[PDB]
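Consortium newsletter contribution from the modelling node. Members have asked for a concrete example of what our holo predictions look like. Here is one, prepared for the 2-acetamido-2-deoxy-beta-D-glucopyranose complex that several groups have been discussing at recent meetings.
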Amino acid sequence: RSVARMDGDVIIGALFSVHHQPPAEKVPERKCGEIREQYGIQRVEAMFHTLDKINADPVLLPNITLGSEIRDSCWHSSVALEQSIEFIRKPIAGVIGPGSSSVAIQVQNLLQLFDIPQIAYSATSIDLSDKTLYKYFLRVVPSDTLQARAMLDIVKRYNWTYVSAVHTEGNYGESGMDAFKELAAQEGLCIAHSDKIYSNAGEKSFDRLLRKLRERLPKARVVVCFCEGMTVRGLLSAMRRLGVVGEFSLIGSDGWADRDEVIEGYEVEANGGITIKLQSPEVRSFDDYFLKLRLDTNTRNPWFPEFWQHRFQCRLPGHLLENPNFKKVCTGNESLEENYVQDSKMGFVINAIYAMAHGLQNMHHALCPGHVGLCDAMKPIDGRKLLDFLIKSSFVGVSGEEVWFDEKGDAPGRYDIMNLQYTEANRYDYVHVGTWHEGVLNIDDYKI
Amino acid sequence: QRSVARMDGDVIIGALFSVHHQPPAEKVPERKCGEIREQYGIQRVEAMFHTLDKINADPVLLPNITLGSEIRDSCWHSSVALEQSIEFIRKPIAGVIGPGSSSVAIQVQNLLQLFDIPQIAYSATSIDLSDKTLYKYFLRVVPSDTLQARAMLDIVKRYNWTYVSAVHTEGNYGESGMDAFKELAAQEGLCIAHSDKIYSNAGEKSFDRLLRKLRERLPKARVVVCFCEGMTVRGLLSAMRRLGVVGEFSLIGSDGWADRDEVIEGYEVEANGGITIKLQSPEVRSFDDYFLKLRLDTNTRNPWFPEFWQHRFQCRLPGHLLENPNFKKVCTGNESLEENYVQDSKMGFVINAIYAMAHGLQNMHHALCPGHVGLCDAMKPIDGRKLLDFLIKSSFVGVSGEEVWFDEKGDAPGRYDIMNLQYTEANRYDYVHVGTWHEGVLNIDDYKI
Ligand SMILES: *[C@@H]1O[C@H](CO)[C@@H](O)[C@H](O)[C@H]1NC(C)=O
Ligand SMILES: *[C@@H]1O[C@H](CO)[C@@H](O)[C@H](O)[C@H]1NC(C)=O
Ligand SMILES: *[C@@H]1O[C@H](CO)[C@@H](O)[C@H](O)[C@H]1NC(C)=O
Ligand SMILES: *[C@@H]1O[C@H](CO)[C@@H](O)[C@H](O)[C@H]1NC(C)=O
Ligand SMILES: N[C@@H](CCC(=O)O)C(=O)O
Ligand SMILES: N[C@@H](CCC(=O)O)C(=O)O
Ligand SMILES: [Mg+2]
Ligand SMILES: [Mg+2]
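And here is the predicted structure:
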């Protein structure tokens, strides 16, 4: 499997969903789906970019260059584990990712055996806060103990007393929904229908899911989905097949948030949806770098050629990765600015990388006092010690966010409440209608 | 540097057994295990040694090819099991026996499958493991809980009940078991009245509500199917006592209840008449003949024996690397293993899992090395992907005379005992054996119920 590398004194591993997960039938041979931009290429480039800057920075890690070994997780436990084995087969100092809680648990179960700290940028499961089971895990995002509370507050806000519940099979949906149901039970909120499903389940399964939900109408119109985006898309698609529109009031978790790829093509069935988004400021710095990448000068990113052809539905003559679905040759001058959309969690990806650097810096200050570069004490780097320095690190993120971790490796965070609506213009957009921070729900009622 | 039980041979079979209890929660990061175990540990380690000795003396099974072993401790925990599984992939292991727990077996299989190493379980019963897209290299000689659902439904249909309530304990066991029951029930025209789930540790208030919801469906739905942990049943019995009701329902429970006294202890009156399922556990006399004769000074192939002996007979071994600090008297070495002796209830499964591995290797040899006495180039090294194909199609007669074979998903047939709680001729409540579910056929003594 391809691997994006950058040499340096200390090597940082990373796991990103460069491709979609393998089709249910291909799982055994671990053959992945199509190339991804927001969750794949953009994150791979964000790592390269962040490391470039850090290595060009005189204050952070003065004479210590950070290298990398970026691997594809295909958002799947089996591929992620396969690739994590490669990390431990210069030794990896720490790992960034993967994005899924279930997948993250699989990776952490192996990494902890070699004392390799892991920092997530999107794994929000409450379970990962258990340090007896996940000692070497930390993250720059808040656990879903909060998101579940935010979701219940929204339901309470609009006096909904009877709701249906759906979650994506796996640790993220299961842990999040269990927390929500626990809160609901305390508050006396009734759950009409409850169901679960795998994001990659067949259409017949999503058909069944939808049918079961409709049967609980019209009393159970509100549907709480602690779901991955693809699970939500699977449901919209099922609504498309049955010819139904606007029957439910969907309230989704961060797997949906304000992601365009989730509702693309199904804006009609998705319209009116209310979602939760992890607050993360747009990273302009990244756009300036990313949009200037060219298919001829970007050689450090092994997947770029595959990406370009897919991004511009064109093919590369003679290229081994020539796409057999497009005829118009790639002019190699197409603009990455067309319909461009930055990964919604870009800030977290970047700050997770910076957290790793700050951990290494803090460790160097303590173990190699007065030394210029790495000293005997950090040759090799002791993962167990690096973990403690990471947990005790605090800094200002790429966009001003205060980043630090509590004893459980959890970071502070908050959410933006989004509402999908048909704007004045002939277009559907994610309107920012509110926020949830420290138990306080603020929603602009006139905006909804 | 965790100890390993070894026996060299032409082909090495790996094994993961719970030689020790899992690490206390706070000792998990350091993977420091608990107390030594006998039935789930030492007895299984010895069962493997004994079985291999027997197979190596068997003129019909692998006549001129010896089997060896690399037995590791799983401490009934995924971190230790993974730690030890890493050691297997670090002579290469042809296959792995174990581990015992489904959640732990899943973690082990996620890794083994990456190296095409077939894994055969003797006690992991999770329905999840039947998914070959996720667990291609997993097979087992113990039935999947989906067969418990089947047996329980067969019991319900036998007495022509049309409506039943359904309760299951939260978690994989309870939820998967009940989902299986419900799928079958729907397909066969059985209606579900009240349906619920609950944690065994839920409060009395929660069990009070559960009982109220069940009673609301009376008298039409007098039968309650419980795919539950024993303590969930106990919670329900406890609620019946508080409410002051008796014999209103006919409870049918999965093996979480089985024939456990701790479940009905003090609530025999409200439990009386319940029907439960239990995995059959045929005693393997030949194992006892071997195990009961083991001695401290001569058993040097089992590295955990010294520790086991000290704990088993509450004595210490002066200056031993693992000298038990809880007892002052010294072991004589002539204590008898027969005192309070109890044979691991899964012993037959453990032995048959080992025999299944041997038969898969034998079948592979016959097909890939025809005419060769020993292993030929086609089996140097053994192609795990091929061994998996041969294992799946292997069948034989087990240690207790049962027929062992696997379906396409690597699942095994199921044989359960059917119990009925009754008040015997004496002033006592006993779990009376009233039937069996023999691989699809329900045999019940209708008069005893
Ligand atoms: C440290 O790195 C800087 C790069 O800006 C270089 O100019 C300087 O000479 C280096 N110092 C040492 C002691 O290597
Ligand atoms: C919820 O119900 C209360 C009580 O009837 C009412 O005062 C409040 O305005 C309602 N809020 C919404 C959003 O409907
Ligand atoms: C194979 O094993 C049998 C059974 O003990 C033995 O009689 C025979 O001599 C062996 N063959 C060889 C070539 O060693
Ligand atoms: C179940 O119903 C069938 C059909 O009437 C009947 O033949 C059979 O005897 C019944 N069994 C019992 C145990 O009542
Ligand atoms: N927070 C989700 C991931 C959502 C997403 O990034 O799409 C998880 O922990 O799995
Ligand atoms: N069947 C249980 C294990 C039972 C036992 O041996 O204690 C499981 O799948 O985890
Ligand atoms: Mg620097
Ligand atoms: Mg033999």
